[PDB]
Amino acid sequence: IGIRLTLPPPKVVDRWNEKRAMFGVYDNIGILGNFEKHPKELIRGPIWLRGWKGNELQRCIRKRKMVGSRMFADDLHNLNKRIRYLYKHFNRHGKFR
Amino acid sequence: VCPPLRSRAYTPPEDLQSRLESYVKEVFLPSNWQDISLEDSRLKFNLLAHLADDLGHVVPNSRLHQMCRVRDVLDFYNVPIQDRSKFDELSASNLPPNLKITWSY
Amino acid sequence: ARALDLLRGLPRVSLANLKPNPGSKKPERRPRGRRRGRKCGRGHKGERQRGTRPRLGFEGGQTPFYIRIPKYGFNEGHSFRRQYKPLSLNRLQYLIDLGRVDPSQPIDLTQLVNGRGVTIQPLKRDYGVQLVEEGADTFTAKVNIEVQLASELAIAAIEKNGGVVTTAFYDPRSLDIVCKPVPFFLRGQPIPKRMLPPEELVPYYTDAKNRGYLADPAKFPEARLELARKYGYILPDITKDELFKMLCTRKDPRQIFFGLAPGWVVNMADKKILKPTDENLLKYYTS
Amino acid sequence: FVESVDEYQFVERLLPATRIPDPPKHEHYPTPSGWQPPRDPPPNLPYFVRRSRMHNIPVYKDITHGNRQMTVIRKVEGDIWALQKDVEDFLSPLLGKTPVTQVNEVTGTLRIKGYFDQELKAWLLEKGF
Amino acid sequence: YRARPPPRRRPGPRWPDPEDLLTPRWQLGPRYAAKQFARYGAASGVVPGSLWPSPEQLRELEAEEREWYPSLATMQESLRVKQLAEE
Amino acid sequence: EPVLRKVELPVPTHRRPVQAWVESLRGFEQERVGLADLHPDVFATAPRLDILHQVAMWQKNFKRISYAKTKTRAEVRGGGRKPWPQKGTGRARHGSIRSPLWRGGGVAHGPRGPTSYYYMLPMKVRALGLKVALTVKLAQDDLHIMDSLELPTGDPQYLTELAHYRRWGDSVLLVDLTHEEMPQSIVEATSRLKTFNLIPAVGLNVHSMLKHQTLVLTLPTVAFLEDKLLWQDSRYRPLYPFSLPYSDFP
Numbered sequence: 001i002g003i004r005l006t007l008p009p010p011k012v013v014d015r016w017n018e019k020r021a022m023f024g025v026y027d028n029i030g031i032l033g034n035f036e037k038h039p040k041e042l043i044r045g046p047i048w049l050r051g052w053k054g055n056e057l058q059r060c061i062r063k064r065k066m067v068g069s070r071m072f073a074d075d076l077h078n079l080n081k082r083i084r085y086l087y088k089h090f091n092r093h094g095k096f097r
Numbered sequence: 098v099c100p101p102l103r104s105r106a107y108t109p110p111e112d113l114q115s116r117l118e119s120y121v122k123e124v125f126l127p128s129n130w131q132d133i134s135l136e137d138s139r140l141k142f143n144l145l146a147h148l149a150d151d152l153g154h155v156v157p158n159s160r161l162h163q164m165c166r167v168r169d170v171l172d173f174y175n176v177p178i179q180d181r182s183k184f185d186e187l188s189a190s191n192l193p194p195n196l197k198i199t200w201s202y
Numbered sequence: 203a204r205a206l207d208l209l210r211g212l213p214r215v216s217l218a219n220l221k222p223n224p225g226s227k228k229p230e231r232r233p234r235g236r237r238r239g240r241k242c243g244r245g246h247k248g249e250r251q252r253g254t255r256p257r258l259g260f261e262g263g264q265t266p267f268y269i270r271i272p273k274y275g276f277n278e279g280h281s282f283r284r285q286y287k288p289l290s291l292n293r294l295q296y297l298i299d300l301g302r303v304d305p306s307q308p309i310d311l312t313q314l315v316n317g318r319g320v321t322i323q324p325l326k327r328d329y330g331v332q333l334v335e336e337g338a339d340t341f342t343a344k345v346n347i348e349v350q351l352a353s354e355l356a357i358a359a360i361e362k363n364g365g366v367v368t369t370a371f372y373d374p375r376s377l378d379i380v381c382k383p384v385p386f387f388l389r390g391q392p393i394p395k396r397m398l399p400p401e402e403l404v405p406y407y408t409d410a411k412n413r414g415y416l417a418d419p420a421k422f423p424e425a426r427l428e429l430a431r432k433y434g435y436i437l438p439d440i441t442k443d444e445l446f447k448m449l450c451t452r453k454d455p456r457q458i459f460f461g462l463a464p465g466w467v468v469n470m471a472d473k474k475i476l477k478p479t480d481e482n483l484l485k486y487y488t489s
Numbered sequence: 490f491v492e493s494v495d496e497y498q499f500v501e502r503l504l505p506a507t508r509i510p511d512p513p514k515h516e517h518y519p520t521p522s523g524w525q526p527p528r529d530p531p532p533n534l535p536y537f538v539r540r541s542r543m544h545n546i547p548v549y550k551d552i553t554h555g556n557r558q559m560t561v562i563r564k565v566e567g568d569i570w571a572l573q574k575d576v577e578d579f580l581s582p583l584l585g586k587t588p589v590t591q592v593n594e595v596t597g598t599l600r601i602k603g604y605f606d607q608e609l610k611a612w613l614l615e616k617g618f
Numbered sequence: 619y620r621a622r623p624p625p626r627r628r629p630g631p632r633w634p635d636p637e638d639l640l641t642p643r644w645q646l647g648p649r650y651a652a653k654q655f656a657r658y659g660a661a662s663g664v665v666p667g668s669l670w671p672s673p674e675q676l677r678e679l680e681a682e683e684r685e686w687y688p689s690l691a692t693m694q695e696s697l698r699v700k701q702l703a704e705e
Numbered sequence: 706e707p708v709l710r711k712v713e714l715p716v717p718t719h720r721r722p723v724q725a726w727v728e729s730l731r732g733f734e735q736e737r738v739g740l741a742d743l744h745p746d747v748f749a750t751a752p753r754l755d756i757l758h759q760v761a762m763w764q765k766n767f768k769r770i771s772y773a774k775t776k777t778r779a780e781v782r783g784g785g786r787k788p789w790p791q792k793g794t795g796r797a798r799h800g801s802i803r804s805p806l807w808r809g810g811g812v813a814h815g816p817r818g819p820t821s822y823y824y825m826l827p828m829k830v831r832a833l834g835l836k837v838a839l840t841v842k843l844a845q846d847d848l849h850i851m852d853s854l855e856l857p858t859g860d861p862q863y864l865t866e867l868a869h870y871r872r873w874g875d876s877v878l879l880v881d882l883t884h885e886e887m888p889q890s891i892v893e894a895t896s897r898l899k900t901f902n903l904i905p906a907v908g909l910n911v912h913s914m915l916k917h918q919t920l921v922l923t924l925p926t927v928a929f930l931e932d933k934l935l936w937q938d939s940r941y942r943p944l945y946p947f948s949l950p951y952s953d954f955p
């Protein structure tokens with residue numbers, strides 16, 4: 001009974017809308033533009049993970065360091081607690097040691 | 098006005114060597130004309146453009162570099178090509194009486 | 203190429219035909235199924251399955267190996283020990299032969315770095331380049347090379363081949379600037395004055411036998427004659443060489459670059475060199 | 490206070506280059522370091538071994554597991570299988586048996602078990618690549 | 619479609635308004651002005667004279683040098699007395 | 706007057722420049738107005754579909770930032786008190802109503818925070834990927850060189866009819882040297898089309914080249930790509946970012 005009795009509404013995807021059509025453009029901005037701009041500068045998103053990657057603990061540490069002062073009170077409390085828990089987990093628990 | 102789409106089919110002419118040597122004389126003459134090296138871009142373009150305009154079949158960019166000699170050009174223009182659909186090919190390949198093929202496309 | 207011909211024969215390459223190179227993508231193992239499920243490879247009870255086994259280095263309570271060994275000053279002061287990248291005469295000859303280091307002009311750390319003959323890391327306590335006797339037997343280039351340290355055999359080879367070698371100190375800041383001048387010029391700061399060697403290194407760079415940049419020039423000919431006698435070659439009279447001026451060109455002890463003087467500002471945007479004129483600034487930058 | 494001048498030659502001298510210079514022409518080869526320019530015209534063989542950007546033969550030692558010693562001829566263009574045959578013929582007398590090799594056609598590389606970098610470099614210099 | 623204009627570095631020097639509280643402090647000091655001069659040259663609009671130390675800064679630097687970097691003569695004298703004592 | 710282009714960059718002594726037909730969009734039948742020599746190391750390299758895949762996946766992923774986040778049992782509202790005592794109730798032991806087990810509880814191992822998938826392939830690898838893409842297009846007869854992108858009219862119907870007549874693909878990626886100088890005619894023609902996309906030379910990328918069936922280039926764009934991609938070959942290892950001044954790098 002966890003299965004729907006009717007076909008879901010047809011899903012139409014426009015493979016040639018502007019976003020899909022122009023996806024990937026300027027990814028070679030650096031090599032093809034005298035390296036004036038690094039491709040990582042094309043990444044639009046959270047300030048603390050623009051052209052940067054890491055595990056959950058590293059991401060939380062970076063978030064607190066970069067925007068922690070501008071975070072809401074309860075969100076910052078949650079971030080501090082998550083950092084604490086992730087520290088304990090990564091530094092004290094696991095199969096390999 | 099867009100001209101009607103050209104058919105990709107091309108059957109090599111019977112007077113292929115005569116036509117090609119006439120074009121070679123027009124563009125460039127010496128003995129063993131089949132070995133005239135097409136290293137000069139001007140002459141290569143002249144010969145290939147004349148051949149394409151005449152025969153309706155042009156050398157693709159992928160084969161343009163390997164067409165190094167008039168012999169290579171002759172080989173490319175004597176190998177034929179057909180553009181009939183797969184349906185036409187299968188139906189004209191002498192289908193046995195018990196094999197029926199239909200397209201719903 | 204046959205590969206390109208096969209492409210011509212094959213369908214179009216699109217985003218629906220791409221495949222990673224076999225062996226580049228290992229399958230991901232996740233704990234579902236008979237083989238990888240149940241205890242999920244963690245074992246049975248104990249600390250290991252609970253994921254609470256003691257820290258690395260713990261030996262169950264027995265005094266750890268890394269703690270029962272006495273402390274010894276193996277790495278005492280490692281961050282304060284000076285490091286000099288080696289530059290073998292083999293490497294120098296290779297660079298000269300390939301034209302990455304021009305022997306017709308005075309060769310120094312900037313030129314070596316530009317030619318990519320050596321990679322200096324001032325942040326890692328590198329203090330410059332040391333000449334190394336390796337390749338001395340087959341070294342034939344005549345060059346005026348300035349380094350930080352030099353071996354007796356390396357000096358002998360350079361001088362035998364008609365070249366000139368001088369050992370010049372570079373404190374960490376000057377070393378960074380000389381290794382990477384363009385970033386410094388983009389910093390916009392006036393060119394600083396190279397600092398003198400620390401007291402421990404002063405006797406080294408004030409010694410003629412080491413061809414120190416602060417040694418008495420009158421003592422150089424005697425040392426060169428001693429090396430020539432010791433290593434059995436005739437000392438070439440470079441004063442008669444057509445490149446004698448280039449061989450003799452040595453930057454001032456307080457000068458980082460050859461022509462540029464301390465205190466100048468290199469405006470690279472408009473190709474200019476602003477030189478201070480205030481008397482106090484000139485006195486400081488000439489000090 | 491300020492005084493601008495045009496002595497930018499000493500700054501141009503410090504400016505580093507980005508393109509590897511073509512090796513200077515020497516009257517005699519091989520050079521004191523042993524380098525030798527590729528022979529011109531190129532050797533007429535089914536394959537071609539392009540030099541590295543440094544103008545050196547693309548033969549490199551490699552080691553895996555701490556005991557698997559290998560030598561890789563990397564920048565091969567043409568008949569990598571002809572190159573494999575030639576390398577096997579060249580190395581069998583030295584090694585004592587036909588060398589074991591992998592011919593990565595896609596990468597155009599030849600990987601031989603064992604360290605033969607110097608011998609292969611000398612052999613390729615003789616072949617003229 | 620047509621691609622949007624390619625991204626480009628903001629041409630010319632960028633001078634944040636000091637009044638704004640959100641402007642980072644490192645973009646307001648003399649070091650930022652010197653960097654702008656070095657990069658964009660005379661178009662920076664910063665007086666070249668500010669690049670060199672002001673007289674008080676020069677006095678501080680000279681005092682620091684006298685304090686921490688001894689002269690060659692002093693170094694040689696210290697080495698000589700050390701060698702004499704050791705001998 | 707044929708438009709004959711020669712390779713400006715040096716060609717390896719063992720390789721011969723590949724050749725292509727220089728075309729023009731000024732007319733339907735203008736399918737051969739010149740002959741262009743393209744550098745072999747750019748347009749006749751090894752078909753490394755593995756590198757094509759690497760670069761395509763890099764382009765797809767390195768910009769990705771998944772914004773999926775779930776509340777852990779610590780972040781779910783409430784769940785501080787013990788639901789009931791350890792012993793005597795006859796029920797399962799629990800410490801909070803928001804543990805992963807409970808309805809409405811936290812997610813044990815869920816998507817955590819906005820995660821970045823940023824990673825950079827070596828610039829040499831990405832340049833080689835561009836080269837391989839160009840070689841694949843040329844070898845499969847999807848690359849069409851042009852003298853210029855000037856159209857007789859801005860009508861999209863003309864461009865579509867020209868592509869159909871020349872037997873181009875359903876999708877055409879047109880490339881011009883710089884964004885500013887792109888002809889107004891082609892700008893208007895491609896602004897209204899969906900499968901015909903006009904990009905500057907600096908915007909060329911493997912993902913778009915693969916998404917579009919045919920790739921239309923101009924002679925200056927060809928020269929631009931040749932120079933930019935060949936520099937990576939024979940460039941030094943960087944001393945500092947190439948944005949900073951160099952002795953000979955523009």
Ligand SMILES: [Mg+2]
Binds near residue numbers: 236
């Ligand atoms: Mg089992």
Ligand SMILES: [Mg+2]
Binds near residue numbers: 247
């Ligand atoms: Mg159990």
Ligand SMILES: [Mg+2]
Binds near residue numbers: 247248
């Ligand atoms: Mg147990």
Ligand SMILES: [Mg+2]
Binds near residue numbers: 263
């Ligand atoms: Mg005990």
Ligand SMILES: [Mg+2]
Binds near residue numbers: 551552
């Ligand atoms: Mg390895």
Ligand SMILES: [Mg+2]
Binds near residue numbers: 779
């Ligand atoms: Mg709670």
Ligand SMILES: [Mg+2]
Binds near residue numbers: 800
């Ligand atoms: Mg509890």
Ligand SMILES: [Mg+2]
Binds near residue numbers: 781809810
């Ligand atoms: Mg919920």
